[PDB]
Amino acid sequence: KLGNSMELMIFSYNQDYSLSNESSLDEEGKGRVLSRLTELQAELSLKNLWQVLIGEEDIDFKLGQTISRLRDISVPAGFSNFEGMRSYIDNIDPKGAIERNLARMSPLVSVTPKKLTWEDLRPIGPHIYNHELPEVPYNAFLLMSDELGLANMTEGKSKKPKTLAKECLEKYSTLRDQTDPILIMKSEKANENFLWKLWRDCVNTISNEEMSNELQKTNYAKWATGDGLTYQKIMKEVAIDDETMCQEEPKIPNKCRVAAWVQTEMNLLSTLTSKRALDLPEIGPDVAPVEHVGSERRKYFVNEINYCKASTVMMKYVLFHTSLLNESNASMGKYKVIPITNRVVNEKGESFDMLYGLAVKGQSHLRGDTDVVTVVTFEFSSTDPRVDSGKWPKYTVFRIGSLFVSGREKSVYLYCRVNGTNKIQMKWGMEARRCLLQSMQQMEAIVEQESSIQGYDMTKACFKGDRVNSPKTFSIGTQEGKLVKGSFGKALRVIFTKCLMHYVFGNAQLEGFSAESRRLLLLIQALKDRKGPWVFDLEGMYSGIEECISNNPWVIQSAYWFNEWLGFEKEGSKV
Amino acid sequence: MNINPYFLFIDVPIQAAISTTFPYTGVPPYSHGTGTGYTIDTVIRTHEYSNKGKQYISDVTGCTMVDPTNGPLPEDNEPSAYAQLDCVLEALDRMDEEHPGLFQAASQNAMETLMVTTVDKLTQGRQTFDWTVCRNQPAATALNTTITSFRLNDLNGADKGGLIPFCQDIIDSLDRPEMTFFSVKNIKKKLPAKNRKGFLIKRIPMKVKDKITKVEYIKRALSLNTMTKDAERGKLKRRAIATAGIQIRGFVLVVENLAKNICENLEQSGLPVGGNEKKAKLSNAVAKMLSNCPPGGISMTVTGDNTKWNECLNPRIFLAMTERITRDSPIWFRDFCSIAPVLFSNKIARLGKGFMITSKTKRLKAQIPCPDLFSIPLERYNEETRAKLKKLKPFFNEEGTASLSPGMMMGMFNMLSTVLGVAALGIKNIGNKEYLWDGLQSSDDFALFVNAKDEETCMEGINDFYRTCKLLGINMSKKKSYCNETGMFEFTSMFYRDGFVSNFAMELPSFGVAGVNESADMAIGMTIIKNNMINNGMGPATAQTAIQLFIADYRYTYKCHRGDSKVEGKRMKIIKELWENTKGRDGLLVADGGPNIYNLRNLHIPEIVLKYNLMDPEYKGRLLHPQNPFVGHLSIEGIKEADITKMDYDAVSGTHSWRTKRNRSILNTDQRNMILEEQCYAKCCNLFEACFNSASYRKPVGQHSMLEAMAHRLRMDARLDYESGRMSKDDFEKAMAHLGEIGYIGSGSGENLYFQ
Amino acid sequence: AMTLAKIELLKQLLRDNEAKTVLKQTTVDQYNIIRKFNTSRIEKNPSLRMKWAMCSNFPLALTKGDMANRIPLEYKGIQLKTNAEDIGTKGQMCSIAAVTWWNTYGPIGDTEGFERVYESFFLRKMRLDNATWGRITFGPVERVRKRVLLNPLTKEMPPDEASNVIMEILFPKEAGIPRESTWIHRELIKEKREKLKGTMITPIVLAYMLERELVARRRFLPVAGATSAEFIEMLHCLQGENWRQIYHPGGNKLTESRSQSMIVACRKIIRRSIVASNPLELAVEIANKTVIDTEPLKSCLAAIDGGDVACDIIRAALGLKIRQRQRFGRLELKRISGRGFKNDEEILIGNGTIQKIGIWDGEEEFHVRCGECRGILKKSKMKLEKLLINSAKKEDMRDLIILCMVFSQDTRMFQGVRGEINFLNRAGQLLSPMYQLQRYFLNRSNDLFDQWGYEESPKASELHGINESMNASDYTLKGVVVTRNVIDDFSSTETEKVSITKNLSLIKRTGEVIMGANDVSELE
RNA sequence: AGCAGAAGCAGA
After folding, report:
1. What gap in Å lies between CA C374 and CA C393, rounded to an integer?
2. I want to staple C138 with a disulfide (CB 3.0 to 4.6 A). Which of A166, A451, B205, C423 is the partner?
3. What are phi and psi of A315, to 5 degrees?
């Protein structure tokens, strides 16, 4: 209010002061004032009058033309202006309106309740049983049960990936020197020459004195990764006048039927082996009693998973996506070669190094998240692809050689495939270790519940069995139409596999399926405990689930397992 | 022997073993391409459920408006938006005499809150649509652009400080004939390239000045920017969400604070609580409804869920809710609350980026914008897009936007929509019949508890409830929901079985790396394990594993493996030399290739404090160097809180507490001019912090100018520093002279008046 | 001195015409807006972005300075940092190795006082080291979802008070107002001052680390047994759903320290003040000049948000909020619905005497607690329509049912009175009608349950009824029900202002009372 | 080609 017309002199009762530098008030006078002010402040607070005082230093909101007229048109139907709605709402009495409005509404508006019974619950997704459709193919990123690792003894410490790939190929020279193969099975639109001439260029560039693992920018590689296949960005003005330019009818996932290989995958991944793959680092010393129990439990839980086959598969996916994400950023526009690495330890405590195949990296100028790098996967395998012909339409397979597995020979097969992934999947690949926790937490809860009842640690009792209690037995699966019993450790490996399979085939079909199926599972739980469950639109639930099933293998096999689980609950419900 | 995982559920019940049903290790679906197709779909779907009502043209905006409220009552089970004002008012009248004094008290506290709430409260709202540039900016930016923009039109509102005069200017800015504002325009500059054509478009942006007409501005103010929702779990098809403008925010927070002050004093609300506080208050409320089960009678629970919740509601209903809720409060506040609905009642919907067309023969592609979307024969679009554009026609506007009166755009009035869903539960009984209902409500997700003599009568109570919901513009999902006798149900994705069961897989994504920095992510990862041990039923063995699984991935993420291992890398080469140089190796951090000391017992304690005494004196002096170069200028929000989907962690100011580049940006956009804009504010703030040491901690208050203050402060600092004996007469008169100039500089009006 | 160097920099900003118009136009208020201002896009999925960027060449951003230049360009064929200067800052960037190099070969820094700065964290390590670990016990534990303090404090205060302490520690010139109930922590301030003097760590951090050990972090947790911070911090290890673990801490005695004393102090001020006439005037003149250790009782009762009843009574007498709750002897009630008119009437009771009672009229509902048992009440005019309780201690399950039947004012309660009921308190004064009925029915419980009568039990899965003996039965008391489901804790977050009577009874603004003097606990 | 899935990436 004064700009800089006068020299201000601010004094406060509670000992504050603001003054100019050029002002000529000495320390003497400043005292006289501030002392007198506080002297009055004390005499006010003593006789209670300090909050009453109004000092020297001591609501309006209305609307304009535009917003008023906006409000006036924002009323419910029937009303003229806002002032009408305001004064209506404030002064009228609406009692008894709901009852009148419900009465004059049509009875067609209802929930249509029907009590839930067992024969109402038909199998979900009838089209998977039909043989006329083609069976679901192997659409995962890497091989799982069909893998084959090339072994190698090592000193027992980390080493570069090219040096590891060289030493592994050095030992098995019969396979490395193959420049004269036999063709087994082919894909629909693939090329055998370019795929094989890649593989040879991978082997040559790996097995040499040089440091650089860069693959040369060859015309056979240009096709395999996809060079110049992007559509060029022309301007909008040109596209409008052009008539042949249209919005393409987008591809729907092709409808497929059940396949037997997913059952086999679930079986073989759950099975035990002598190998142990996990790379879990150390922790601190176990001081507290709880930490001893946790470490005691871990020894059983962890190793029971570690021995299993799914654990060996998991660490392959992780360390591959770990190195793939690194190469995609450091060398963006360079055709590189990456090996399929995994470290292993066996029962005796000796260090092995595995090599399941090679992988050619494509051009990875990745700006966005969804942007797709193209990877070409060359993988070793014992399995013959002509056993299940419908399993390998996407893959191109070669026959390179033979290996002494133990007693008799086994045929070696190199599985070629053009593949793709993105920064997202590479991130979730690195964080795919957590399948342990999802499965382990579930089984640890069962142990704690058991230990709560009796009053001591039941970890030993559940796995192996001890003095009083027998081993804990879960219903693990079926054998041509009857129930089968399995041990505690097997149930851990089953759930751990399921958890891993969520990542392998993780896409929109899985998320949408598991969410809608979970509702139907809860209804089946209500029937088991006898809680008289009710449903409103049963076909609505089924219609929501059935559209999720198309070409995702785990979804289709889960649908088959669900219907078999539903059928064996009907038999169990009658008793 | 064939294996089956679902057979697990024979021995174990499903709720206790629900963790297995959620595939949260797996990859969620992301957004490919544009979201215009989904945006149009929702624009239709919203109008589809309200097409029977009155259609009319807005005299202000000049758009196609639809109004289903007090419309015809439906004669079918398809979704309905045709709410009845009379019913909503009765539901509230029922609710008021149940909780007498609530409605006026919530209006008092929300008002006495507003009276103090300052403009800067708007700063904390993450994403915001900045009308000045037609792009999504971060809150505090959109605010500051609008503040400076307003000053050009002589709208000095933010200067006063309070939110009221700022919102006064917002509704006064709609009256302005010509709106001048600060804006960004790109400059299409050319460069040489060795790629096919032989040239390259390097887009440089700079700060310019653009003008707009009254009508065009109102349209921009009422706009909402749409997009596709990334990583949406538990759903097959992708859906599109929206973002709000900076103008409407001011009025929203007042109404959401009012609807909060209602929902706090409601037992059936599952809001605004979070974490265990929810689990507790729910288990309390579950009992409150169980108890109503009369003698010799059955109690049932409906696992509720609403479809087309955000699409079938209507601003006009919410507008009545405020005018009801505020009854006793004075006029200005009643007018204030009325705005936030109105601006949604007359809202406009942006249509994203637009579709793209191609030709497989010539291998060419081209983007089709929203304005030039119909300038093209309809046959050239595909079958599903054609039908969408056909029904979009009347609601479409010629400058690339869609009119949209109904709907609430994918969530915004979350609190007050719960109040409406609660008001439905507040009826309880119809026709003096032989049943009673109550329930739990949380936005779209609800859970009804119906009590009756027998379960046949319960269905008639559910049927009446379903029918009463239709009157309020709420659509219960026949397709998805279900019901059963009391014992177990679902609610906000939290399952019940004689008590709310724990579920681990839900929180599984958080266990991984956070993505802030080495020092922070460590303490975060352990704090997640610590919380999940207590809250979500994780045992010690899983927790100990989760420790390993974090450190394992942590090392591969940040490339900081053990010092005694031969993992060859760029950083790892230096770690090995550090491992050899140092004697106290157990005291090293994991980021410096040290060992993981963490275990269940010491999770709550930070890494640096655990190992401090075991470090070398030379190592800690570098690790914890006071003036180290990697931190930068700190804020209290940066050290304490972190982003997860927010939470607060604990850590030390170490060298590993560093920050990122300023995320790249899209294309060769040389953002030189705009980066100076950022630094210009920073340097001022950085100098402001030096003058006013507090600043970062104590948010300072003053209507006067920043400079004007810094002059007056730096004066007095010199005054004191002369008396106490820090500066001499020569250095003092230097300052008083230098400042003298700064005064003349700070009271001019244009040039700096240099001299010779 | 720095003073002059600021002025020179300010003048150098006023050369640039853009920065001039910032400082001219933008307000001190708006400072808080422009500091958060940035360009950029807040990118979704930062964990994805971190893994991606960490693999790249130069993800880190580096602050310019003399200390930045001591980092070299290369080291044994490795690129640490980059030259490419951005035109705005004239500034730089660096790689992951740049930090690792600094920790290896960088310069020494003055790390003196570091222990005292982050003292609040170091006290957690002190607790873990010296703590002895007891035996483990496998058994089912019922976990009460309680409101609890997460982290132990040096001295509990509210944010409003603690800030003005923090100010006078670190920023004594800018603090401004000399407040009443703020400075008197002069022992703590002068202590912190000398401890945090030699260090040269950024103030903003010091303030945050003071706030961590002066402000309450109170959240809801599933808790059983001990309810003290130094336990709660370890809760993850101390207990789970299906197991337990004993633990004894560093053992310096905190949190409970003031909580326990404040209770006793207030209770004992009451017992003395009740007797002599005008208890209020004595309770004030006493509590004003009482002390706990060094703090006057005013600041303790105000700062700590715990207490029992006597605390809240003494609070109200002095003049601060207490908590929006209602108490009746041992019973606790939080209003969840309804509102009633306490209306005077002449009432006949069972024994045959006329007592002048006030009658609560109107439909009501209440969340109710007593001891270890919690539940929900519904009543009307002289009628207990419904009551619910949870499986807990039978002594308290009984008391809860009784005390609800008392305040419900059910006619069946009034008719069940037998004999005379002239009860007195400590001072020798006549208790008011209902406070009399309380102690009669707690003593003679069996007379009530016979008069009440029985009805059918509700057939809902997780419910069952009870009888005179407080045992499971198919019969149930008219209205009362028991449930298997566990119930929420007490839970009373919000706070309210209250007035007080001559007889140390607390009156809500409406006209009713919530906390009576007679409602305290005798336990010493 | 391939990832993928109602629309994009396969350098700008």
Report:
1. 11
2. A451
3. -60, -25
- Asked if C60 and B123 come within 8 Å (Cβ–Cβ), the reply is no
CA distances from B326 to A463, B93, B266 (A): 65, 13, 18
A211 touches chain B (CB under 8 A): no
Instruction: Give the Cβ contact number of residue A326 at 10 Å.
Output: 20
Strand-pair partners of A399: A182, A413
Resolution (A): 4.1
Min Cα separation A537/chain C (Å): 26
**Binding-site residues from annotation of B:** 239, 304-310, 411, 444-445, 490
CA dist., res. B640 & res. C317, Å (int) = 39
Q: Where are the alpha helices (DSSP H) in B14-139?
A: 36-48, 85-98, 102-114
Task: Report the candidate in B456, B434, B457, B437 with the shortest Cα–Cα distance to residue B447.
Answer: B437
Residue C444: phi and psi, rounded to 5, are: -95, 85
- Cβ <8 Å between A452 and C242: yes
Neighbours of C56 (CB within 10 A): 15
Strand B348-350 vs strand B223-228: parallel, antiparallel, or unpaired?
Answer: parallel
- Report the alpha-carbon distance of residue B607 to residue B592 in Å, rounded: 12
Report the structure determination method: X-ray
Listed residue (A341, A349, A345, A305) closest to A490, CA to CA: A305
Neighbour tally for A399: CB within 10 Å: 17
Instruction: Find, among C272, B332, C229, the residue nearest to A61 by Cα.
Output: B332
Q: Tell me how crowded residue C278 is: count the other CB atoms within 10 A of its CB.
A: 11
Task: Estimate the share of chain C in helix, then strand, then coil, as percent rounded to the nearest 5.
Answer: 35, 25, 40
Q: Do C55 and A329 contact (CB within 8 A), yes or no?
A: yes
**Nearest residue in chain B measured CA to CA from A562:** B6
Q: Please, are residues B268 and B363 in contact by the beta-carbon 8 Å criterion?
A: no
The two beta strands, C132-137 and C81-86, are unpaired
Task: Answer yes or no: do B357 and A263 touch at CB < 8 A.
Answer: no
Contacts of C25 in chain B (CB under 8 A): 148, 151, 705
Q: Which of residues 411-440 of B touch A (CB under 8 A)?
A: 427, 430-431
Quick check: C316 and C506 in contact, CB under 8 A? yes
The residue type at B701: V
The tokens describing C386, both together, are 């419904």
Contact C376, C365 (CB under 8 A): yes
Q: How many residue contacts between B and C have a Cβ separation below 8 Å?
A: 483
- CA dist list (Å): B44 to A76, B403, B417: 21, 11, 22
The DSSP secondary-structure symbol of C27 reads B
Q: Tell me which chain B residues have a C-beta less than 8 angstroms from the C-beta of C474.
A: none
Give me the residue label for tokens 């526009």: A333
Residue pair A416/A199 in contact (Cβ under 8 Å)? The answer is yes
**How many CB pairs (< 8 A) connect A and C?**
64
Nearest to A427 among C51, C135, C237 (CB): C51
Kindly determine whether residue C174 and residue B693, on different chains, have CB atoms separated by under 8 Å: yes
Q: How far is B368 from chain A (nearest CA, A)?
A: 6
CB A525 within 8 A of CB B13: yes
Q: Using omega within 30 degrees of 0 as the cis cutoff, is the peptide bond preceding C140 cis?
A: no
DSSP, collapsed to helix, strand or coil, labels residue C515 as: strand
Q: How many helices (H) and strands (E) does chain B have?
A: 24, 22
The label of the residue with tokens 């679906």 reads B29
CB C125 within 8 A of CB B609: yes
- Binding site feature residues of B for CTP: 239, 307-310, 411
Whole-angstrom distance, CA of residue B136 vs CA of residue B130: 6
The verdict on B14 touching A (C-beta cutoff 8 Å) is yes
Strand pairing report for A483-486 and A474-478: antiparallel
* Torsion sign (Cα): A301, A307, A309, A310: positive
Q: Dihedral of CA A443/A448/A454/A459: which sign?
A: positive
